[PDB]
Amino acid sequence: GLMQFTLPVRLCKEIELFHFDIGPFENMWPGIFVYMVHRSCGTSCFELEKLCRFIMSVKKNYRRVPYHNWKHAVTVAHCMYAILQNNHTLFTDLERKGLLIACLCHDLDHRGFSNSYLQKFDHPLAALYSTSTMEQHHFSQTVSILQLEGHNIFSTLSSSEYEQVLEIIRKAIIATDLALYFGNRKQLEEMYQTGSLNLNNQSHRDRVIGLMMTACDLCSVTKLWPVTKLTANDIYAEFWAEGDEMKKLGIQPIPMMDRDKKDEVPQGQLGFYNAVAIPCYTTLTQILPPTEPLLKACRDNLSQWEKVIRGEE
Ligand SMILES: Cc1nn(-c2ccccn2)c2sc(NC(=O)c3ccccc3)cc12
Ligand SMILES: [Mg+2]
Numbered sequence: 001g002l003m004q005f006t007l008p009v010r011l012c013k014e015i016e017l018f019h020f021d022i023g024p025f026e027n028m029w030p031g032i033f034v035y036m037v038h039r040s041c042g043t044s045c046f047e048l049e050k051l052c053r054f055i056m057s058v059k060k061n062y063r064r065v066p067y068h069n070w071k072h073a074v075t076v077a078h079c080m081y082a083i084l085q086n087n088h089t090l091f092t093d094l095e096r097k098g099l100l101i102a103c104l105c106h107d108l109d110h111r112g113f114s115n116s117y118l119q120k121f122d123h124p125l126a127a128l129y130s131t132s133t134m135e136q137h138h139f140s141q142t143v144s145i146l147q148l149e150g151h152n153i154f155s156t157l158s159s160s161e162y163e164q165v166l167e168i169i170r171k172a173i174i175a176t177d178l179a180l181y182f183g184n185r186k187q188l189e190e191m192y193q194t195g196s197l198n199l200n201n202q203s204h205r206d207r208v209i210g211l212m213m214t215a216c217d218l219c220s221v222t223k224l225w226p227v228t229k230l231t232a233n234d235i236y237a238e239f240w241a242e243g244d245e246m247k248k249l250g251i252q253p254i255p256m257m258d259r260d261k262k263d264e265v266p267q268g269q270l271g272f273y274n275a276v277a278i279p280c281y282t283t284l285t286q287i288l289p290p291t292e293p294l295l296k297a298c299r300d301n302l303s304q305w306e307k308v309i310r311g312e313e
């Protein structure tokens, strides 16, 4: 079992960095991901043929939408890989295995519509799960793919460890529901500052992994400016599509989702960086100091959106 995936020189160096961009070649993302699982985990932890059949089925079940697509899945996994590599000692053999699978599967079968739109459209999935509607759906789909033949990449685990790792993945994926983020971060801030944040508490680990999942999901805000700028077009194109479907139901959508209100994009990004992104990576850096590069890049992009409002670009 001496088959070590290697990346060309620039990628091999650049991939270790939080701000790495996985590039425009779809055909290299599976190799990128496997390279990350091997360095991150062990060459031992998964059987290559099962892994490769698991990854390809996950790709086939991501859809052709402007932002919540197979590129995004691999990007989020990459940022999780970077967090783990810079915090080597804090995570168990199970967490490292589970979390990179979580990140790849976190937006499985996403059609480009918020939980909110499912509720007002009255989509069946919203009948089955009242809160975190898409996030329970994503997990449901992960589990479906796990139970295909030749796809049980966790087959070498006891009954116990298997249940722990699937409960890591479930909590991980639920935590990508941003409505949950606000409370999760309020509570972590209050634990860190009253000195009670304790990582042996399974209750406290769950919340901290929940924060990493938010950090990894937002991580287009932590890239270099030209990648941040260009991903914004993809993000807004999903939002505008949904506002279009909102209007189709007889509902004026919020200005974020109204494509007649493009003028207000950079101001909307300010709001988001101030109200979400900066607080997210602020709190995460207090809990996990080696993630500071995420806060630095996030402030830089906040500063680059201020320059777009002031006419200097
Ligand atoms: C204005 C804007 N930019 N932007 C963005 C920028 C970079 C990367 C990802 N997202 C977001 S995400 C968001 N709000 C939610 O997704 C949401 C979901 C459920 C409940 C409440 C809010 C708003 C917003
Ligand atoms: Mg999602």
Ligand SMILES: [Zn+2]
Binding pocket: 072, 076, 106, 107, 176, 217
């Ligand atoms: Zn996502």
